[PDB]
Amino acid sequence: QEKEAIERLKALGFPESLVIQAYFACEKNENLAANFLLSQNFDDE
Q1: 10 close to 33: Cβ distance less than 8 angstroms
Q2: Residue 29 region by backbone torsions, left for phi larger than 0, else alpha for psi between -120 and 50, else beta
Q3: Alpha-carbon span 5 to 23, nearest angstrom
Q4: Regarding the domain delimited by 1-45, which CATH topology (the fold level of the hierarchy) does it fall under?
Q5: Nearest 10 degrees: Cα torsion 36, 38, 42, 44
Q6: Chain-centre distance of CA 10, in angstroms?
Q7: Which of these, 4, 1, 26, 43, lies nearest to 34 by C-alpha position?
Q8: Cα separation, 9 vs 37, whole angstroms
């Protein structure tokens, strides 16, 4: 139901591995995920 983002979040240029846990952590949210992906840079592994 949220897989439509798992490619749109990946297509931003990121790996699917962050995508999953950046969507689901942000409550499968488009806008909030493009904030966990693009604003939560400060993070290793």
Answers
A1: no
A2: beta
A3: 8
A4: Helicase, Ruva Protein; domain 3 (1.10.8)
A5: 80
A6: 7
A7: 26
A8: 8
